[PDB]
Structure formats: C-alpha cells, structure tokens
Amino acid sequence: IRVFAIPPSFASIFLTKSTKLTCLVTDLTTYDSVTISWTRQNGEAVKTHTNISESHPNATFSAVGEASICEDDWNSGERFTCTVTHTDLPSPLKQTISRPKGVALHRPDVYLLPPAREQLNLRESATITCLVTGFSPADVFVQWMQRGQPLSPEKYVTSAPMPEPQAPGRYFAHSILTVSEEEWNTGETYTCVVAHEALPNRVTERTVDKSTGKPTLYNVSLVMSDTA
Amino acid sequence: IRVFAIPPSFASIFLTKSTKLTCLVTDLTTYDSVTISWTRQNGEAVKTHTNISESHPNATFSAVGEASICEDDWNSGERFTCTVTHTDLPSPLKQTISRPKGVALHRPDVYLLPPAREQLNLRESATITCLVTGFSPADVFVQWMQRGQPLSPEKYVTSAPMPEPQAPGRYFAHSILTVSEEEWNTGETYTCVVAHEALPNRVTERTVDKSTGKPTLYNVSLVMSDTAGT
Amino acid sequence: PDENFCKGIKNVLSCPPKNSTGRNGDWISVAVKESSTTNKGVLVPPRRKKLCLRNINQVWHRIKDEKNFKEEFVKVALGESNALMKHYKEKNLNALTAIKYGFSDMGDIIKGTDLIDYQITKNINRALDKILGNETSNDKIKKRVDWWEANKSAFWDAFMCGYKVHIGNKPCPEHDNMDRIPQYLRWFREWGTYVCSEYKNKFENVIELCNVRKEDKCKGALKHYEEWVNRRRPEWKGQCDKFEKEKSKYEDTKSRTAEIYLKEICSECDCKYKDLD
Amino acid sequence: ERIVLVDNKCKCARITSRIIRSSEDPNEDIVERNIRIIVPLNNRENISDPTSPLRTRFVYHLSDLCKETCYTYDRNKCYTAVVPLVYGGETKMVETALTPDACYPD
Ligand SMILES: *[C@@H]1O[C@H](CO)[C@@H](O[C@@H]2O[C@H](CO)[C@@H](O)[C@H](O)[C@H]2NC(C)=O)[C@H](O)[C@H]1NC(C)=O
Ligand SMILES: *[C@@H]1O[C@H](CO)[C@@H](O)[C@H](O)[C@H]1NC(C)=O
Numbered sequence: 001i002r003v004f005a006i007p008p009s010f011a012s013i014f015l016t017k018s019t020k021l022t023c024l025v026t027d028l029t030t031y032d033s034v035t036i037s038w039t040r041q042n043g044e045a046v047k048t049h050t051n052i053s054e055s056h057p058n059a060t061f062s063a064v065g066e067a068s069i070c071e072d073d074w075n076s077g078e079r080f081t082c083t084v085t086h087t088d089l090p091s092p093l094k095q096t097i098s099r100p101k102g103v104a105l106h107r108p109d110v111y112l113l114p115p116a117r118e119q120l121n122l123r124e125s126a127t128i129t130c131l132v133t134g135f136s137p138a139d140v141f142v143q144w145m146q147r148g149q150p151l152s153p154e155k156y157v158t159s160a161p162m163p164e165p166q167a168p169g170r171y172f173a174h175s176i177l178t179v180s181e182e183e184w185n186t187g188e189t190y191t192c193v194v195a196h197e198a199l200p201n202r203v204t205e206r207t208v209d210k211s212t213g214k215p216t217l218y219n220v221s222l223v224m225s226d227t228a
Numbered sequence: 229i230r231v232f233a234i235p236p237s238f239a240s241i242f243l244t245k246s247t248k249l250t251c252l253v254t255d256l257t258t259y260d261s262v263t264i265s266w267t268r269q270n271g272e273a274v275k276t277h278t279n280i281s282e283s284h285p286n287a288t289f290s291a292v293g294e295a296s297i298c299e300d301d302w303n304s305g306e307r308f309t310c311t312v313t314h315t316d317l318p319s320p321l322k323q324t325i326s327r328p329k330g331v332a333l334h335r336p337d338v339y340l341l342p343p344a345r346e347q348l349n350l351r352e353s354a355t356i357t358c359l360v361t362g363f364s365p366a367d368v369f370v371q372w373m374q375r376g377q378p379l380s381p382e383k384y385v386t387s388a389p390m391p392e393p394q395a396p397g398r399y400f401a402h403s404i405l406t407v408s409e410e411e412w413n414t415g416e417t418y419t420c421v422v423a424h425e426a427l428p429n430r431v432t433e434r435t436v437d438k439s440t441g442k443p444t445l446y447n448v449s450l451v452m453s454d455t456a457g458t
Numbered sequence: 459p460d461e462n463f464c465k466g467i468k469n470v471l472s473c474p475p476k477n478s479t480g481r482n483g484d485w486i487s488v489a490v491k492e493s494s495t496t497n498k499g500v501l502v503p504p505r506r507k508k509l510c511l512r513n514i515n516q517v518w519h520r521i522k523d524e525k526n527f528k529e530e531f532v533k534v535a536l537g538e539s540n541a542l543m544k545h546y547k548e549k550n551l552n553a554l555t556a557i558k559y560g561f562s563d564m565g566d567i568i569k570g571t572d573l574i575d576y577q578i579t580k581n582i583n584r585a586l587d588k589i590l591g592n593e594t595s596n597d598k599i600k601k602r603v604d605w606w607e608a609n610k611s612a613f614w615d616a617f618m619c620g621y622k623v624h625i626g627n628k629p630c631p632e633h634d635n636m637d638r639i640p641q642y643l644r645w646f647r648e649w650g651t652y653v654c655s656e657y658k659n660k661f662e663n664v665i666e667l668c669n670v671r672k673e674d675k676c677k678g679a680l681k682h683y684e685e686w687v688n689r690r691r692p693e694w695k696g697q698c699d700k701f702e703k704e705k706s707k708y709e710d711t712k713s714r715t716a717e718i719y720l721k722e723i724c725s726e727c728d729c730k731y732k733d734l735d
Numbered sequence: 736e737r738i739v740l741v742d743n744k745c746k747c748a749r750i751t752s753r754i755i756r757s758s759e760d761p762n763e764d765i766v767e768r769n770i771r772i773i774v775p776l777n778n779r780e781n782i783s784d785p786t787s788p789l790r791t792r793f794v795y796h797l798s799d800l801c802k803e804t805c806y807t808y809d810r811n812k813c814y815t816a817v818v819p820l821v822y823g824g825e826t827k828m829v830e831t832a833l834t835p836d837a838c839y840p841d
C-alpha cells in the first residue's frame with residue numbers, strides 16, 4: 001500500500017536526454033478512480049499521466065506516470081511531491097523524491113588501460129578496461145564509442161560503484177570490454193566516455209589504440225668477441 | 229532482524245582445510261536462546277555453533293554459525309539448512325544452502341595491467357588492476373603481495389564477481405591496489421595471487437613492476453663470446 | 459574432370475599457427491557478435507576466431523577493380539589452405555571440413571551477413587560496395603550475394619589448390635553446395651562434430667576404465683566426464699534455443715528437434731546429443 | 736642436412752653446422768654455423784623467483800653452453816615457487832604454477 005517513487009539518476013537523464021519522475025504503487029491491486037499528481041512547493045500540476053499498468057498477483061500495479069521537466073529544475077532541488085489518491089484510502093499518499101543535498105562534487109579522473117601483453121600473446125581477445133575513480137557521488141554512466149558510433153551495451157559491462165579504501169568520500173568503478181584481438185592488431189581507436197555531474201562538461205573521453213603503449217626506444221648492445 | 233547465510237568460499241575449503249558454515253543473525257534484540265545445529269540432508273546434525281556475542285556496535289544482537297562438514301559431502305552437493313531456536317522469531321526460519329551442482333569449471337586467467345601513463349604523470353598515486361577472466365563459478369579468492377610478503381586487506385579492494393559481458397557462463401573479477409607513485413618508480417615487484425577450484429595447482433601467480441608493465445624503453449646488453457666454439 | 463586448372467602462384471603473407479596457443483582455442487569464449495539478443499547462444503569456433511585476413515587487411519583501400527578483388531581473396535584462400543592443413547597434418551585428421559567451413563565463412567564475410575561484429579568485415583563490405591556501385595541496402599546485399607555466387611569458383615579452386623598440393627593423385631571432392639546454409643547452422647555442425655569426437659574419446663576412456671575395473675583412477679575419469687558435460691551443457695542449451703528461434707525459415711531445418719537436424723544431414727558421429735530429457 | 740651439435744634449452748641456443756656443397760671444382764666450399772639463439776627479453780634474473788627485477792645483460796658463453804642461472808623457461812620442466820597466502824591471522828605457504836602447460840596435471 002506504498003507508492004514507491006524512483007528519482008531519476010544521472011545515468012537515466014544522460015541516456016534518455018530527458019527527465020522522468022515516476023510513481024510506482026506497490027502491494028495494491030488495480031482499482032478505478034486513480035488520482036496521481038506531481039506537485040512542487042507552490043504547486044504546478046501541469047503534466048499528464050500515461051501508460052497505466054495492469055493488475056499483478058503480486059499486487060505491484062504500477063500506475064506509473066512520467067513527468068517531463070527541465071534539466072536544471074531537478075538539479076535545483078525543487079523537491080517534487082507525488083500525491084496519490086485512490087479508492088482504498090481517501091487520504092492522499094504523499095511520497096517525495098529530490099536531488100541529494102550536501103553531496104560533494106569531486107570530478108572523476110578516468111584512466112584508460114590498454115590490454116596487457118599477455119592478452120595479445122594468446123591471440124583470443126582483447127580486454128580493454130576503463131578505470132574511473134575519484135568521483136564522490138555514485139552516478140556513473142559509461143559508454144564505448146568506436147569511430148563515433150556507440151557500441152552495443154552487451155560488449156561492455158559497467159560494474160556498480162564501490163567504496164574507495166584510501167579515499168573515504170570517493171568511489172571507484174571499472175567498465176571492461178571484450179573485443180577481438182585481431183581488430184586490436186589492425187589499429188582502431190576505442191574511446192571510453194564517463195558521465196558524471198562533477199565533471200566540468202559531464203563528459204570526459206579517453207582514447208586507447210595499438211600505439212598508445214609502446215617502447216619509445218630500443219637499447220640493443222650487440223657485443224661479439226672471439227676472446228673469453 | 230537481519231539474517232544471512234554465507235557459503236564457505238574455496239579459500240576457506242583450501243587454506244583452512246575445514247568447511248565452516250555460518251548463518252549470521254544480526255540487528256535484532258538479545259535473548260541469548262540460540263542453539264543451532266546444522267541439519268544435513270537427513271534429520272541428523274554434525275556440530276553446534278560457537279562464540280555467540282550478546283553485544284553489537286548499535287546495541288543489538290549479533291549471531292554466528294559454526295560447523296565442520298567433510299569435504300566429500302560438499303563435493304556431493306547435499307542440501308544444508310540453518311534453523312533458528314532463538315526466541316524472537318515465533319517460527320524458525322530455514323535457509324537452504326548447498327554447493328550448486330552442474331556448474332562448469334573454467335580455469336581463470338590472471339592478467340596484470342600497469343598504471344596508465346596519464347595517472348603516473350600526477351605523481352601522487354599509482355593504481356594497478358588485477359583483472360581475472362573466465363572463471364566458473366563466481367567464487368574467486370584474490371590476494372596482493374609486495375616482494376613476497378602480503379599486504380593489509382585495506383590496501384587493495386576487489387570487486388564482487390560479475391557475469392561476463394559476452395561469454396555465456398564465465399565470470400570476471402577486478403581488483404585494484406592503490407600505492408604511492410614513488411614506490412612504482414623504484415621498481416618494487418607487485419604481484420597478484422588468485423585462488424580458484426578450477427586452477428591446476430589451485431594457485432597461479434603473476435608479477436608486474438616498472439620494468440615489466442608497459443616499460444618506456446627496452447634496455448638489453450647483448451654480449452657474446454667464444455664464437456669459434458668447441 | 460573434377461580437378462582444378464593450373465593456377466599461378468601469388469604472393470601470400472605468413473599467418474600465425476593455429477596450434478601456437480597452448481589453450482588450443484576456446485569454443486565457449488565468444489568475442490564479438492552482431493547481436494546477442496536476436497542471435498543468442500551461438501558459439502564462435504576457434505577457426506573463425508583464428509581466421510587470418512592479413513592479406514586483405516593490407517590492401518583493402520588501394521584496391522580499385524573486381525579482378526584484383528577476386529585475386530586478393532585467392533591469395534588469402536591459399537594462406538588459409540596452407541594454415542588449416544598444416545595444423546591438421548600434425549593432428550592427422552581430414553581437413554576438407556575445415557577448408558569448406560573456412561570458404562563458407564569467407565563468403566559470408568564477403569556478403570556482410572557473417573555473424574561477426576568485425577570492423578574488418580565492415581571495411582571489406584564498404585570496399586565491395588564501392589567496387590560494384592552504391593545502392594540501397596537490400597539491393598546492394600542482393601548484388602553482393604550474386605557477385606559472390608558468380609565468383610566463388612576461383613576461390614574454391616584455390617582452396618583445392620592448397621588441398622591438392624598435398625593430397626595429389628586422389629580425386630578432388632565435390633562442392634556440396636552448402637553456401638545457402640547460413641553461418642550459425644554451420645557453426646552448430648562444427649560444434650557438434652567437435653563435441654562428438656570429444657565424447658567419443660571420453661566415453662572410450664570411461665568405458666575402458668570403469669566397465670572393466672571403483673578404482674580411484676576410474677573415479678577421476680568419471681569426474682572428468684562430469685566436468686566436461688557440465689561445461690558443454692550451456693553451449694547446447696544456447697545453440698538449441700537459437701535453432702528454435704530461427705526454426706521456421708528454411709526447408710532443411712523444418713525437422714523439429716535440433717539434434718536430429720545435426721544427425722540426419724552431415725558432420726556428426728550419431729553417438730550423443732546431450733538432451734535434457 | 737645440418738648437424739645439431741648443441742641445443743641448450745635455457746639459453747635456447749641451437750648450435751648447428753652446415754656445409755654448402757660446391758660445384759665440380761677444387762674444394763673451397765663454405766662451412767657455416769647455423770646458430771639461432773632466442774632472447775626472452777622480458778624474463779627476470781632469478782627464473783624461479785617471480786619477485787626479481789628485469790634482466791638486461793644476457794651473457795651467452797657459446798663454449799660454456801656446449802658442455803649458472805638459466806634464461807628462458809622450458810615447457811618440459813617445471814619452474815615453480817612458493818607464495819604465502821592468508822585467510823586471516825594464519826599464514827599458509829602454497830606452491831604455485833609460474834607457467835602453464837608445463838606443470839598441468841597429466
Ligand atoms: C634464486 O636462485 C637460487 C639459486 O642460485 C635459488 O635459491 C635456492 O634454490 C633452491 C633450489 O630451488 C631452493 O631449495 C632454496 O630454498 C633457494 N633459496 C632460498 C633462500 O629460498 C632460487 O631459485 C632463487 N632464490 C629464491 C629465494 O627464490
Ligand atoms: C642505452 O645504452 C647505453 C649504453 O649501452 C647507455 O649509456 C644509456 O644510458 C642507455 N639509455 C638509457 C636511456 O639508459
């Protein structure tokens with residue numbers, strides 16, 4: 001009998017380019033006269049609700065209604081309130097979501113590691129990892145683009161952020177990608193992007209290639225003598 | 229009221245040479261009426277738990293489990309459960325735990341990636357990733373050592389095992405050791421050890437340092453003598 | 459005649475050995491696919507992963523005519539014929555299946571319908587499109603299919619040139635015209651043949667140990683068999699699921715169970731099928 | 736047609752000599768030594784100890800290898816070491832397999 005409301009993380013607003021404010025009802029079957037609204041402090045119920053769900057024997061009838069707002073309004077801590085009025089309870093069900101307050105904004109220092117030499121000796125595949133660390137919030141959305149066009153999400157897995165041991169307020173996240181080793185031998189730029197609020201432009205790109213990690217000079221010293 | 233049953237990892241099977249089942253009950257009121265015997269597939273039990281603490285940092289109850297089951301039973305995969313006698317729960321809770329049967333055994337590959345040159349230009353910290361590929365099942369044990377003696381667990385952090393992006397049943401593990409930049413520049417050998425059941429010797433070790441991991445130059449003194457031969 | 463005419467020798471670049479890797483390839487490890495959602499559970503062979511396209515990778519941009527386009531694929535086909543047979547000469551096995559599978563894989567790369575996400579495949583597709591002219595997607599796909607169907611003769615003759623530099627006097631085999639069979643069915647057949655050979659070996663071992671003699675070595679043999687079947691079951695599940703999804707679109711695959719499709723046509727030992735039932 | 740006099744595995748030297756057969760003339764035919772020695776270029780000085788630095792100076796005494804810590808691993812033999820392992824307060828020393836395909840259970 002609780003209407004869970006999901007706050008749009010930075011990954012969602014980055015991937016979908018717009019804002020979604022949703023109200024999902026849990027442990028409640030489908031009844032008529034559904035009344036849901038998104039309201040701020042002074043009050044602007046100026047949006048519509050679409051895609052009403054259907055009953056489920058687990059009683060998770062969503063009754064979801066997505067709200068589209070400006071990007072900076074959500075970042076301004078408007079503290080939107082979702083009030084749900086239904087037949088079971090005449091009193092409105094007030095559940096609220098807001099942008100977190102007081103969180104420090106420390107920009108990530110993304111490091112792109114080329115595949116190891118032991119990767120390439122077996123000639124099976126190349127495992128490029130994208131090391132993202134130093135971000136104090138945990139809103140990380142990492143894509144991979146080759147030659148401009150983004151890669152499929154199936155190739156790369158972005159692990160959930162985990163606490164940093166040395167830095168108490170910072171988190172680290174790693175996103176590896178598995179690609180064929182001969183394609184690495186051909187020579188093609190693989191770019192890993194990181195999306196985060198604390199970045200000056202919320203986008204930082206690093207480029208890896210066959211020639212990023214190479215010995216700059218060779219110091220062969222051939223010494224042949226016929227004496228002992 | 230929080231309850232968790234943690235399977236013994238292969239490190240607990242190998243290093244400790246004893247299988248210890250723990251069904252921990254935490255964050256609840258204290259009654260001191262815990263008497264839990266680990267039930268086998270049949271009705272009989274093997275051993276009772278030990279060392280229950282009646283205190284918690286948040287002033288609650290913290291419980292632990294303890295037993296000694298033969299390793300052949302775990303190889304058989306018989307289902308085990310932990311039932312509670314402690315009096316806060318009106319009905320005992322059962323947590324069925326067993327080794328999964330039918331899972332594949334792929335040998336993991338231990339791979340070391342040196343710190344990026346961009347990070348080394350900062351001159352404060354150097355991060356090295358011990359990337360493990362193609363182990364099944366998920367339970368993997370990883371350690372970091374410097375020149376043969378182990379490091380503290382706080383220095384290096386390892387991520388939870390996750391499914392492989394493209395492989396059907398394989399898993400990958402990613403572990404990082406954060407050290408100062410000057411230590412990396414001195415040439416200290418940093419090594420990673422991964423323990424898994426599917427390995428040949430159950431332990432495989434790899435070593436990386438400044439000269440090995442993406443070195444800037446190849447210095448070689450190619451001296452030869454007595455080309456006349458005998 | 460059922461042979462090939464005397465073909466001039468062309469320059470070919472060296473390729474890494476197929477047996478150079480100590481692991482000898484991994485069937486389970488798949489690197490890149492077009493999509494793992496609509497094409498789920500399909501397994502790439504080590505042969506496809508080790509498919510050496512070094513010859514065409516050097517001159518994929520300098521090429522400007524279809525005569526050189528045919529000639530360059532002949533050069534890489536000769537290299538594949540040398541590489542596959544030398545690998546199986548040490549293994550003492552017939553290399554005709556590998557030769558025809560490699561030819562079909564190369565032809566599907568020429569089509570652009572090969573079940574791979576190579577940019578090399580995209581580069582060759584763009585080069586062939588600019589060779590014949592640019593049209594709409596379906597039109598250029600059909601034109602490339604027609605061009606490969608017309609020009610496969612020289613490529614296949616080069617393959618038996620590499621075959622007959624070793625076999626010699628014995629007659630050349632027939633084409634068998636499986637080019638209409640797509641990539642995933644051929645990978646299914648290759649996987650079935652490989653896993654059936656390994657089941658033959660492991661079953662022979664477990665019989666010769668357990669049936670005559672519970673010895674500890676026999677218990678180890680049973681444990682190895684259990685490990686291998688546990689490893690190979692998800693592969694069968696994924697490939698059978700893929701077969702069920704792409705079931706209805708050809709006549710040859712109208713036979714309902716995938717195992718009998720493997721059994722009834724070719725490239726199998728009629729021994730084991732790993733059915734969950 | 737070449738006689739392999741000495742084939743040392745660690746130095747990975749191949750001491751073999753061949754004679755080019757001349758035409759119908761007095762003998763000035765060329766005698767050669769087909770020695771082909773391979774460097775690891777990334778192995779450490781103490782091949783058994785993984786914690787060694789990189790070796791730069793490779794000393795190849797050709798007369799000595801005909802009849803000294805050795806350079807490259809051999810797939811036939813095992814070069815193994817012991818590494819500590821900790822699950823907690825206890826410390827256990829476990830032998831490890833430095834190279835695959837050499838100590839694999841066969
Ligand atoms: C460095 O090489 C030396 C040989 O010059 C070895 O040291 C001893 O090797 C023997 C035989 O393997 C072992 O039984 C000894 O335990 C080694 N000594 C020590 C102190 O461990 C060895 O190959 C290398 N040394 C080390 C410490 O790894
Ligand atoms: C290269 O070798 C020479 C002598 O062989 C040495 O003097 C020089 O320092 C080496 N280069 C570097 C960068 O150390």
Ligand SMILES: *[C@@H]1O[C@H](CO)[C@@H](O)[C@H](O)[C@H]1NC(C)=O
Pocket residue numbers: 219447448449791792
């Ligand atoms: C490079 O090798 C030469 C000759 O062995 C040596 O004199 C020099 O000190 C070396 N330099 C470094 C940086 O290792």
